[PDB]
Design a protein around this ligand. Sequence first.
Ligand SMILES: Nc1ncnc2c1ncn2[C@@H]1O[C@H](COP(=O)(O)OP(=O)(O)OP(=O)(O)O)[C@@H](O)[C@H]1O
Ligand SMILES: Nc1ncnc2c1ncn2[C@@H]1O[C@H](COP(=O)(O)OP(=O)(O)OP(=O)(O)O)[C@@H](O)[C@H]1O
Ligand SMILES: Nc1ncnc2c1ncn2[C@@H]1O[C@H](COP(=O)(O)OP(=O)(O)OP(=O)(O)O)[C@@H](O)[C@H]1O
Ligand SMILES: [Mg+2]
Ligand SMILES: [Mg+2]
Ligand SMILES: [Mg+2]
Lengths: 48, 43, 98, 98, 498, 528, 132
Amino acid sequence: RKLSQTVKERIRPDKDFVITVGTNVDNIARQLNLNIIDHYDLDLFNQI
Amino acid sequence: LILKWNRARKEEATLQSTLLFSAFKVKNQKSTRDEILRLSKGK
Amino acid sequence: EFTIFGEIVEIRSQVYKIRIDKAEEEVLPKVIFYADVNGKEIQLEVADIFDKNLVSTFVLGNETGLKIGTKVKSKNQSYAIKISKRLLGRVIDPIGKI
Amino acid sequence: ELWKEAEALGFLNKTAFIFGQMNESPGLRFRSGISGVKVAEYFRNNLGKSVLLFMDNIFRYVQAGSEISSLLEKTPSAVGYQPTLFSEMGQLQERINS
Amino acid sequence: SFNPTNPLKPIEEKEFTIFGEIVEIRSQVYKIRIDKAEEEVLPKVIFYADVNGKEIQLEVADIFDKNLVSTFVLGNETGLKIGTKVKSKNQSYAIKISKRLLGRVIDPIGKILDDSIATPVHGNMYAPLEMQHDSEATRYVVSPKNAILETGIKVIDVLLPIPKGGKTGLLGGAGVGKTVIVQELINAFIKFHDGVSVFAGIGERIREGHELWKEAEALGFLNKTAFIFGQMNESPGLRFRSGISGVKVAEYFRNNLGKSVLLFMDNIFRYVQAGSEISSLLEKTPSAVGYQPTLFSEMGQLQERINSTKDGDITSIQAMYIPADDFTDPAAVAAFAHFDSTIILSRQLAAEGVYPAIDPLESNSKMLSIKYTSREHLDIAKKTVQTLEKTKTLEDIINILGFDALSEDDKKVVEVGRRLKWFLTQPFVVAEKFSGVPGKFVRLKDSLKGIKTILDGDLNHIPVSYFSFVGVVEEIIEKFNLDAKKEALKNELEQNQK
Amino acid sequence: MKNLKITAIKDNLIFVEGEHQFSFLEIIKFSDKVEGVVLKANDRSAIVAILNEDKDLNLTVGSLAEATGELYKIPIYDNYLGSIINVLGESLVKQYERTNVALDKKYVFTEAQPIFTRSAVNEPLVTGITVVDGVLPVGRGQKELIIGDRGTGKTAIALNAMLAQENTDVINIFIAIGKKRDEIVEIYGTFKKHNILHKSIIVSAASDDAVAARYLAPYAGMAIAEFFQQIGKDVLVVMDDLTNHADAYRELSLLAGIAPAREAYPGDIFYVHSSLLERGGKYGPEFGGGSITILPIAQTLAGDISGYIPTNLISITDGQIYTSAKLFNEGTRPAIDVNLSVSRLGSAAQSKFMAFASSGLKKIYTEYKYLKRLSSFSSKISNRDLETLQKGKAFESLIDQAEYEVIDYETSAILFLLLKKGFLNFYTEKTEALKVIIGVIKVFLAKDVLGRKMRAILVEHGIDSIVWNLYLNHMILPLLKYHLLSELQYLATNREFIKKFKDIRNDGRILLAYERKGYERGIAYDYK
Amino acid sequence: DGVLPVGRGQKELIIGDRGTGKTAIALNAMLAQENTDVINIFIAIGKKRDEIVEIYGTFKKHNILHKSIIVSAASDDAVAARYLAPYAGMAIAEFFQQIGKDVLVVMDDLTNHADAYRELSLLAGIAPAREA
Ligand SMILES: Nc1ncnc2c1ncn2[C@@H]1O[C@H](COP(=O)(O)OP(=O)(O)OP(=O)(O)O)[C@@H](O)[C@H]1O
Ligand SMILES: Nc1ncnc2c1ncn2[C@@H]1O[C@H](COP(=O)(O)OP(=O)(O)OP(=O)(O)O)[C@@H](O)[C@H]1O
Ligand SMILES: Nc1ncnc2c1ncn2[C@@H]1O[C@H](COP(=O)(O)OP(=O)(O)OP(=O)(O)O)[C@@H](O)[C@H]1O
Ligand SMILES: [Mg+2]
Ligand SMILES: [Mg+2]
Ligand SMILES: [Mg+2]
């Protein structure tokens, strides 16, 4: 919820593009209707 | 867990002791009744 | 007036059996029998009435001085205490001792 | 200590104390609450005042009742308690009404 | 035709020879003093009394003197006073038995319970308490168990096979599902059985007995079933004799007609409870937990008559009640010694939604032997129970230390264990009223194939939720495939739209 | 004439002497009012448990008594309705005058009617509680136990169930065993306020009354209920509570000299409660043709449902309702734990529309709890599990309901239908908005003539009819769509939201009108 | 045989829960004496008749029947019979031992024997002790 507040604060849907990995932040972005360029899976972060 | 075990064991032990003494107190009713009779008569 | 009279025929810790000798009325449950020993009175409350004469009691207070053959009498009433507005500021026990 | 503090803080003149303490026989401990209830009833009914009854410790009333029942050779129930436990609690508590 | 070798013999005709009156009264227990008698009174005989034309029977328990006996009532005591006249034939209680009992609902003493006009049941008078045989050795000519019944329930068919000619027991606390499993077994066994069926309700609900009688009428197997009902509204004297009467009826149908009897008893704990109450009312020294001293003997006196001989088989399915969920209760310990198959129900599993709430880690079956099943069935059952035990051990580690502490093997073991646990649940045909999910009947080989597939790890991709309350594993596969197809079609449609 | 004499008074029991033919529960009359019941008897002596007391009688050794020769039968009087009575039939608080002609005399230990006199349960008993009426149905003739901890709202549930019978033909009977007098008087006042007094009786045995009175009170209440049922009336009986009754029986047995058993209760406590409770049910027309619905109440210790008396009672009744102390501590009223509760009658004790509206919601709730308590490795949640979680969270918001609030059966059915069809899942992020919309829908269905028309056509034409579908699509769904758009704007683009709310107009004038009406008694500056 | 040795003349209890394989262990002990000179006596206290018959059949199949005795007191026999069964079995064992034989005795099981004795004592009028 702190991340949701921060994203709602310092991101604009027109001049900014959001890459979301994981279901939670993907849902947050979709609710904020931001520009989701692409989506990944959380396991991708496991291997650097 | 300690609390529950202590409570349960106390309850079970008290019930067992009372039930054991029940037989002894039943088997000695006649003596009590005769003593009551002879005390009632008395002097 | 004190209507019931009798003696003590059985003793134990806190429990005493009383045999009634003279009574103008039948004993009632929970009435108080008074025993006067060495200038002090001791109250025994009726619990069980086994017979017209025999009865069992438990002591309301200290029991020192009670013994077999102690004479007891009762008004066939329960225990009573003195109550008024002069009771405020005083310290008493349940039976009214100061 | 409580009696001294009541005297020193100034509310002793409007408080009545009935003390059946752990040094007493089971009869007095068992009758303390009943005597307090009777005193409060007198204060409300005869003097037309509002009474704040205070009991401590109320568990000792139950303990004294169980001790008296054990002394009278009655079969205990639950954790060695008297069969007439809730009946005695009701007897004490039903008289504190409005 | 069939030639009986140990047939039951009807009681002997007699005249009332003992006369007396009630000198002490109590609730359910009365003392009778005998005034006139041409013979000495025997234990367990019946004294009859009449009050306003209503007959009251009292069974003899103790014989203090030549003239004084103690008795307990078989039925309602309303009407008995001091001085009521009683007469006795010096014989124990008897009921009318014949082939006409099938489809009739009676109580332990033979009172009609299915119509108000009380249509009589024809037959001969037989005394359930009096069992007659040539000698003790005759009781040892019994057939060995050599068959297993198929129930259609995955867990029971795989891990806890039910004997034919043996005894199975369903143990559990209050409201865990004993009656539902008993009704499902009745549905899956009767109408396909080469014989007759006897149901004995012992201290159970009146509504349950009415429901079962109506279901028997509706599904057409009423005429093949004999009902006996001493329920929880009856006196201790009647709840103590329901099982004896049911066993006597089964023995009549086996010894005298050469039929195989399916005996259902519910609830078999109430028989012991009623015996305990009767013993307590007669002022006898209690045993531990306040039970009667003769608890094990009383259980054996009823359980040993349920045997299988060359005339036929008597298969017993019994429900046992566990007071306060205490499985160390003396009644449970006494009952454990007689069950060839034992099925123990868990309250925690029922709370989680597992139905039937059978705990395979607490149950056992003696039919899991090479003498009765194949090698493959034994191996599958052993592997299943081992995997469930390992999963139960690992769940504590998961709960306390988190999930990442496990290895790759432990995680795979937990996944297989969860899938196995949720695959064993199954919707019952009788349980359609509770939810509405249609019942399923899974045969043994389908259950074995599904359990083997799950054990191999073939279905670890399918989420656990899909495994609950299905039949064969093909249903799980179909549901998964259809859901994946719907997801793929929706994704393709939205990507076409974008 | 007097024929007995008192010889001893021990253990609160009276020993009488005198030749007579005693019987169990035979009435012994010590005066014109004080009576006792014979417990055991020789041919010249008896042991008696008193039922009531008199100040002036002074019952002691040597007092004379009469053996009436008859059993303990309770008499029925016309003025029982709207009154509090004791076990002997004396009006402690009465509303009307009594004519001294007894309508009937009913035996206290009347045996239950046999199997052939019963009938299947097929008619609902509206308790006024949404979750009870929809997921835990109670029919006419069904025994539903109310099991719970101390101070969790069981008496409130029973009182709500009885207050819901204000506009029905069901007679309420409330048996109180060892309750507080100032609570019985408060319940009497509550009955008087809600206009159900004329059809309600209270049978009272106080906590300090005679042990025989506390033991025999439920049987006297059941005899009264049986009298009412013999003229073909539906009776709803509430026993509060059977823990006190078990305690009274244990006290009487232990003072009478009986040996103890598990938890010191006598060995036949189960028989006591089972023979008491087997006298309620649905009966065929040839045997009265009524019903006796019982709602016993019982108390657990620290939420231990596996206690001796709670499990003894569960094995007698047809399901139970469990009230949680954890839920009650969180301000959730009623604190009903649905996962631990059950009704064994099921959909057979519901109306067709109610049965269809909540067909598989209890199982969904159990699955929702199981998933919520489950810890897994893959933090990816399948669509089915997401649907289950959302529907369970939505269901959790229908339980809340104010005290003494009676919700109509059709309102509960409509709310459960809305939940089942999936319209309430979108509120998974805002629960206060869900509460507001449920309140608005309830007000609309209760007050507006179109809401009552909707409920009436739901009753007579069913859910599947075209008229009810039109009513749902033009009255209720637009309001939900408007509220969801207002509270959560992003739902305007959600795929499922578009799929469901496709041919639904975004009309929300009902909520705005009700908000205006509520705020019209509004002031710019507060006085306090 | 290897880790928990049993010698001739040693009384060795078999203790456990229900359905764990105690009777199976005792039966294995008796079946291993097929080629030896030990005499088997099996005492059943409060056991089911069908189980005893099955055990007799198992004895017959493994050719150890010709030197095996079963002393049976079923679960519905008189309580005095169940109390006296182990003593009679041990008397038979002592008869065989007095002529120089080796005897293996199995009692299944002594908890039922204690229960039978407790029932006898409570019925007779003996004061109860720990666990009655
Ligand atoms: N739905 C409700 N909403 C709000 N308050 C409620 C509700 N139901 C009950 N209460 C309140 O909660 C309190 C406890 O309820 P109640 O006295 O009925 O419970 P109980 O289980 O009968 O308790 P006790 O153990 O004292 O008999 C009471 O003050 C009651 O008014
Ligand atoms: N197979 C099942 N499927 C669904 N629900 C079930 C199943 N078995 C039991 N239940 C649930 O459990 C409840 C109790 O079942 P049942 O009547 O068989 O219990 P019981 O063990 O006989 O109880 P009691 O101790 O009261 O005799 C049912 O009403 C039902 O809600
Ligand atoms: N070595 C073994 N291998 C496989 N199964 C075995 C083995 N030993 C025993 N069993 C099985 O274990 C089960 C219990 O057998 P057994 O009769 O010895 O048990 P028990 O401990 O005496 O039980 P109870 O309490 O019923 O008397 C049976 O199903 C039997 O087939
Ligand atoms: Mg059942
Ligand atoms: Mg309450
Ligand atoms: Mg064994």
